[PDB]
Amino acid sequence: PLIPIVVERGERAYDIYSRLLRERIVCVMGPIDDSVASLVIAQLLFLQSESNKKPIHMYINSPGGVVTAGLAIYDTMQYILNPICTWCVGQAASMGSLLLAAGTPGMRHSLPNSRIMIHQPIQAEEIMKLKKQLYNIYAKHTKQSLQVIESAMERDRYMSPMEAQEFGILDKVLVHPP
Amino acid sequence: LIPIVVEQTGRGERAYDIYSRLLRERIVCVMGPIDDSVASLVIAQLLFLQSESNKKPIHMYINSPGGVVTAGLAIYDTMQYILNPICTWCVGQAASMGSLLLAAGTPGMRHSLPNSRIMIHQPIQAEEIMKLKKQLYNIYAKHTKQSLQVIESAMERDRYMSPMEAQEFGILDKVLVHPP
Amino acid sequence: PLIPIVVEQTERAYDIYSRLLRERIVCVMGPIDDSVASLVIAQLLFLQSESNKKPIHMYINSPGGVVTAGLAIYDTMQYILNPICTWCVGQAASMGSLLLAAGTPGMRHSLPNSRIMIHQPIQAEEIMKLKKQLYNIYAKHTKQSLQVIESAMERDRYMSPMEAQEFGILDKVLVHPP
Amino acid sequence: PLIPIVVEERAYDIYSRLLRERIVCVMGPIDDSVASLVIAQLLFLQSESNKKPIHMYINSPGGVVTAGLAIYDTMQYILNPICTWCVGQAASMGSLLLAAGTPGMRHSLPNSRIMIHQPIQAEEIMKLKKQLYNIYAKHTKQSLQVIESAMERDRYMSPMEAQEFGILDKVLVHPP
Amino acid sequence: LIPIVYDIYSRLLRERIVCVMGPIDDSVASLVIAQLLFLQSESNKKPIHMYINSPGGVVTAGLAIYDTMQYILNPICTWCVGQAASMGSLLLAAGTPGMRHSLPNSRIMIHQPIQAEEIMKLKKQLYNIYAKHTKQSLQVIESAMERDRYMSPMEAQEFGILDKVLVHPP
Amino acid sequence: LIPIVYDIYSRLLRERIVCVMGPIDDSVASLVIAQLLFLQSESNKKPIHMYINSPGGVVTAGLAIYDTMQYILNPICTWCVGQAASMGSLLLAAGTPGMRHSLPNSRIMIHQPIQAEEIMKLKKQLYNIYAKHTKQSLQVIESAMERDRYMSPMEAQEFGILDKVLVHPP
Amino acid sequence: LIPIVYDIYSRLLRERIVCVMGPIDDSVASLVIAQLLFLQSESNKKPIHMYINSPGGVVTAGLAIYDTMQYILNPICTWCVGQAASMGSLLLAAGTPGMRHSLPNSRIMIHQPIQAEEIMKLKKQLYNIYAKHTKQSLQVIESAMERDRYMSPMEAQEFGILDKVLVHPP
Amino acid sequence: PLIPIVYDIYSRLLRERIVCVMGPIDDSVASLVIAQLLFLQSESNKKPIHMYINSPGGVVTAGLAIYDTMQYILNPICTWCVGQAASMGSLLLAAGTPGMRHSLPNSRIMIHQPIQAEEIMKLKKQLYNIYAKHTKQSLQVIESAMERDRYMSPMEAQEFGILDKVLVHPP
Amino acid sequence: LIPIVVYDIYSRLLRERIVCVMGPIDDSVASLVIAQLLFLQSESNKKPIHMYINSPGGVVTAGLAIYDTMQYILNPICTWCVGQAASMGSLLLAAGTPGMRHSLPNSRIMIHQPIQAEEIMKLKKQLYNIYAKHTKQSLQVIESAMERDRYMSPMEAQEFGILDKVLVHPP
């Protein structure tokens, strides 16, 4: 995996991901662990410092990951004052779909062929407390009841972008820009 | 060991790695197995090239045996999303998700060199695996302009196509031995 | 993972973590070992030299780690004269929660969905000497008795941020900046 | 781990910046590779000073004896004052380096742990042990029998017990 | 170390008890099928006890055991001890009606943790077999199997997977 | 490398002694269950001795042994030697009342070191079983199990896990 | 752990049943061939039962079994339970006509998942053998084998791979 | 891995009431030793049992399982330290019937010992009491000696109270 | 694959009062050798025991465990060095009853020897004394000779005091 260099006062050379960061785009790609969370959180704090009002784009192609790391990203998204556009490309499963649903209302996007899953693939009470935290967060942003969330999360299935929009996880399914 | 080449940018010379220099020619490489990492890199390049011009064509170099479906679909959706014409170039082989990206190029601009091999056959719950298979049927039918019955039947065969067979089937438009 | 580069107007460019250090923010992320402790300690000494009075922000998302390495960070936090704001994001368990509680009083923070654990997952007497050192440090910074600390640390459980605030581990649970 | 860059305008990695503050790290297990780096830094810092002290940051569980002795001899060889700082722990060869600091300049932070117990043919191993006995006795100013007896017990001492024992001089909670 | 009395499992076979224990693969299916054919030869009318504590396994191997259970003429008692999940619960439910048992603290799961058309053809085969032996409709089976959960023995009896939950022998 | 007298474990079985040693998994549970069924076939009145030196193991496998202990009609003497932690202590407490034993230096732990709701259902099953056999309330069991500690044999006798701490035979 | 009756697989061979399990390699081929020669010596006319649940394996090893099946003069009943894919289905189809069986839920695949000319020569050998026992034309064989799919037992009977689909004995 | 037949040599050695405590002690070793002790007690609960000890130590609860069983059975137990008895091995050596604790001349004995913190310390005190009981020393002498990372000669262990006799030849 | 002979060939060797100490000596090897020595002494405390030695050495305490047992039993012990007897192997060779320590012509013998420091030295001095006792050389001749990293020929070892007879063929 070699990262390409692009060229953007004068001419500066970045690696393509750093150039993506200058377009206020943050990537949440692959499994989410403490390392990914810290990097995402760092980028969110940086982008808010450059403007606490210009939107931030969050590119999400993740199968999920560690819950506390995902929750670290979630809490930081709520904490910063910027509007956050989430973009599901490929898939958003487990904590990935939670972050997708955690975007600013009206700015949660998916491309047409993405797959979304809210099903989720340390002591016992302790695992259940984290589950209830996920129930509350999903209920809050999908605007569904806890009963619908608990029931839906019990089903080992993915949603298409259209059914995820009807469920309240995302707001727009775009084939091309509007 | 990746070679370094110099281009003059206007006020001086810049050194790139040869792949980064290829990106300055609006050519994106999709080579080897496609995973989330490849998809993110390709998508990043597609968004970058569109920003530099949403009307100059983008060349997609494809030499891939396939890969993860959702990662392939992420590239596919991004190809449709951007406004640029996309020329696809099959060199070596385009199998499984690779052939899907090849066929997803802008009509009339889907290319193969003479000795390439193309395969649309494809080498997690059960219903969900079938939903992805049905997403693949629809995309192939859409871009080859064949019926779903012909796509489902052809994908059931474990075989490769010649570039001339892929052109007749609708995966690509031109087989070039030299440039025109 | 590739680490992005950001640009600051001075035009300087750094890696995002080096830029985070310029905001007087130090990261304690993942398992704590001698290598992490030395890096954190180096950053604390550097930030104090740039000003022994501007606050230092300590980002904590850690499951714990080596006790002596954690204690090395703790002692250095007490040694420097700067006020230290601790920020629990994701989780602070074992030595992580000790560092969280060791922040300057009134400046110990957690985001809403963090998890905090003071339970802890060499000869026999020596292992017990370290445990009592941890009892003392927790008692000092939570302002609880040794009997309350020893009893609470025996329970294999996590606390919510609000529960950690009543226990005395942290001072504020913030959803947005005030 | 990613190592941060700091700017003094010149930019260095934070460990290179630490070297500029005349601080040398003896960090983790000590082997020939670590000794060489420490020795190189010690020779560098002595050239570059009009006898200003060198700070030796020690957080080590020990390591190979000959590598530890290589650092020890170099500490004695350079004719500079060396402040030793025990943070976290100094066990085995780590505690020998700690005690080998210039008298009056051996430090520990409050919660550090210090161990002089130690976790090639037989005679050859025993010769190195006496070499350790002699060095400890010299710098703690304890008798050889107190050192042999103390090293025989597998225990750590608190910083204040290490100050009474003669391994270090000062236990500091804040700078004085 | 396996104790000697025969070896304890061979002695269990002489008491007409067959163990379906752990993950089911082609090897397990071959062993169980071999035992079923033998016990039928020594008597095609004395019951066979099938002890089931399995998390599931390979579908075709599970179906191989199922078809052999259907093929032989003996009445088969299925006994869920510990757990019967995935193909394990299918074998449990495939016992002779009235002779499907579970102990009180067992867990039963019908949820299930090759080309695409082939995997779903196998799934419908599981739907029909479950529907046949639980006497539930195909929509009730398809809906229930989609839920990633275990049921208690009482709940599995009410669903039609087993017939009796015994604390002591009857 | 086991010694033969039979092999020493098989001869121990002839004294109606079954060993539960080390981590409990599906394999250990099946062997123990097989042995329990065998000894009660030889007698349903003579006591069976269960030697327990285990740090715990898989919950469903432990529950499989537990259910079989309750199912069989024999009185079961449990003997804690070394340690009985997690599922091991559950088996220890599940012995016939008055016949739950420990040697003086053993350690006993009821603390316990798949979806979420399912892990919690199994935890509640452990709460119920412990409450039943120690005759303590559910809040005393839930509270005690949250503590990561061992009990002395005398302390476990007072908690209700065992009945007798013997230094020599009486 | 293989139970003793001496071992259940050896006892099953005394019933003139040979198992073809798992991946077929030279080792399995030699074992099956040995059993076939043995069963022919005890009687050249009594049928031999060949139980097949195999995903396939090495071509030359499969062909070694095939050649031996035709070489011996006994009638051989083939039984597909679970699956017969690749070389497994070839052996299934190679049973004596009228004596090729499958249980209801089996899956059968004739698709197949050394220098180039060599691989193609082996492929036509498979085409010929299938064609002979399928009583289908070679173009129908080449075309069907190119399709990456399984057949139901009824679909395999109709294609000529097997003769009867039995749920119980007739 | 290769074991001679006379019965297995260890099985035959068991027929003269000699049980081996060999190498590192774990739950597996403890169970076999306990099994052997119960068996030999059934055969005669008054003829002595010989415990052959060459062990560097092992798991405490496993060693304590053997210890409790030694006290539980009604037989006199002769312990024989040959090679070494360190950590739990020396505890079993000292736990033999008084007057019947033996060592050969060149053996090495160590009482120094090379899960939560409170529990580790609880087991340590259990070892202090057991050593104190069988060596007839004070807890302070035991705690004090166990902190020293050293071995004893057989004569020094006889003087400490761990063993009773050091034999070069039989009496 | 171990051949069986009109039981297994090693079991037949034991019945010939021949004990093998082959390869590296560890606690496991030692207890089996000790087991065999005690067994043959029961079958006769006066008929000689043959000890076949082809070993590069091994664990000191395990070697001393066998050494102490060789001295403990009342039997005459013939030691036979074939191939090599190095480190603890050569000490066992020299520990045979005087006049009955043998080597075949092309064997190699080494007394050089390829846990805390003081205790390592205690074991070394124990080896010095045991060699000196059976070689009837002074401690300095043993200490000095063990310092050379070399092997001796059987003749070279006979004069030294390690062995008594070098035999091409039986006498």
Ligand SMILES: CC[C@H](C)[C@H]1C(=O)N(Cc2cccc3ccccc23)C[C@@H]2N(C(=O)NCc3ccc(Br)cc3)CCC(=O)N12
């Ligand atoms: C929304 C942030 C507030 C405004 C505020 C605050 O709560 N914390 C605390 C904090 C620390 C660490 C991790 C945290 C994660 C979640 C929430 C809080 C965190 C620090 C932040 N700071 C900043 O964002 N500086 C700009 C900057 C950041 C990164 C980079 Br790269 C470059 C520039 C420094 C100045 C300041 O007031 N705050």
Ligand SMILES: CC[C@H](C)[C@H]1C(=O)N(Cc2cccc3ccccc23)C[C@@H]2N(C(=O)NCc3ccc(Br)cc3)CCC(=O)N12
């Ligand atoms: C065709 C895109 C639209 C134009 C639009 C948009 O939908 N998203 C959303 C977006 C986010 C993340 C991943 C996405 C993947 C697929 C589609 C959308 C994605 C951002 C994009 N942006 C851009 O493309 N900026 C220029 C640039 C990109 C990369 C590099 Br390197 C350098 C420069 C920022 C400005 C902007 O409006 N859009």
Ligand SMILES: CC[C@H](C)[C@H]1C(=O)N(Cc2cccc3ccccc23)C[C@@H]2N(C(=O)NCc3ccc(Br)cc3)CCC(=O)N12
């Ligand atoms: C709070 C520090 C004191 C003020 C004081 C002191 O006790 N030690 C000793 C010391 C050494 C090593 C690790 C220690 C960890 C804990 C405590 C002490 C440590 C050195 C420090 N020094 C400094 O901090 N120099 C500025 C600087 C540091 C790092 C970087 Br990167 C860039 C700039 C050099 C000048 C000076 O007096 N002290």
Ligand SMILES: CC[C@H](C)[C@H]1C(=O)N(Cc2cccc3ccccc23)C[C@@H]2N(C(=O)NCc3ccc(Br)cc3)CCC(=O)N12
């Ligand atoms: C206190 C040192 C003496 C004064 C003296 C001396 O004995 N040796 C000898 C020497 C050689 C090799 C390894 C040794 C290791 C331990 C001790 C001695 C060593 C060299 C040293 N030298 C120096 O220290 N140069 C300064 C410098 C060092 C490193 C770097 Br990076 C940059 C600058 C060169 C100039 C000079 O006289 N000596």
Ligand SMILES: CC[C@H](C)[C@H]1C(=O)N(Cc2cccc3ccccc23)C[C@@H]2N(C(=O)NCc3ccc(Br)cc3)CCC(=O)N12
């Ligand atoms: C249900 C039995 C039917 C009557 C019948 C039949 O369909 N097959 C076919 C068969 C072959 C291989 C595997 C099969 C798996 C599933 C179903 C059928 C299988 C063989 C059976 N035979 C028998 O069961 N012999 C008794 C015996 C068996 C095993 C052992 Br161990 C000891 C004794 C031999 C004589 C005979 O007619 N049948």
Ligand SMILES: CC[C@H](C)[C@H]1C(=O)N(Cc2cccc3ccccc23)C[C@@H]2N(C(=O)NCc3ccc(Br)cc3)CCC(=O)N12
């Ligand atoms: C206490 C059991 C009852 C008595 C009763 C019964 O419920 N099951 C069912 C059963 C099957 C499999 C595993 C089970 C595990 C838990 C409970 C039930 C199980 C079989 C048992 N049988 C027996 O125990 N035979 C004696 C024997 C067993 C093993 C060995 Br080795 C040697 C001898 C055969 C005859 C019979 O009526 N029952």
Ligand SMILES: CC[C@H](C)[C@H]1C(=O)N(Cc2cccc3ccccc23)C[C@@H]2N(C(=O)NCc3ccc(Br)cc3)CCC(=O)N12
């Ligand atoms: C002519 C047909 C008979 C098969 C014939 C024959 O061709 N070969 C040759 C042969 C060798 C090796 C593998 C072959 C594979 C395919 C065909 C032939 C093979 C030997 C066989 N023999 C036998 O079958 N002996 C009975 C028996 C066999 C196995 C066992 Br187990 C027990 C008893 C020995 C006596 C005999 O004339 N023939």
Ligand SMILES: CC[C@H](C)[C@H]1C(=O)N(Cc2cccc3ccccc23)C[C@@H]2N(C(=O)NCc3ccc(Br)cc3)CCC(=O)N12
């Ligand atoms: C009163 C004297 C005996 C110690 C007494 C007793 O307390 N328990 C309890 C027991 C159970 C399990 C493990 C224990 C470990 C440590 C201590 C006690 C254990 C069983 C023992 N039994 C016996 O020793 N049978 C002889 C025998 C044993 C093994 C072999 Br192999 C061959 C023969 C069976 C009959 C009996 O009354 N007792």
Ligand SMILES: CC[C@H](C)[C@H]1C(=O)N(Cc2cccc3ccccc23)C[C@@H]2N(C(=O)NCc3ccc(Br)cc3)CCC(=O)N12
């Ligand atoms: C007086 C001479 C004997 C050495 C004496 C004795 O000191 N111990 C103690 C002993 C125990 C364990 C390991 C020891 C290793 C080194 C020395 C002593 C050991 C046991 C031995 N016993 C015996 O040798 N029985 C003969 C025999 C043994 C094994 C086999 Br297989 C077959 C036959 C049983 C009865 C008996 O009085 N003694």
Ligand SMILES: [Mg+2]
């Ligand atoms: Mg926001």
Ligand SMILES: [Mg+2]
């Ligand atoms: Mg387009």
Ligand SMILES: [Mg+2]
């Ligand atoms: Mg401070």
Ligand SMILES: [Mg+2]
């Ligand atoms: Mg000095």
Ligand SMILES: [Mg+2]
């Ligand atoms: Mg039936």
Ligand SMILES: [Mg+2]
């Ligand atoms: Mg009962």
Ligand SMILES: [Mg+2]
């Ligand atoms: Mg034929």
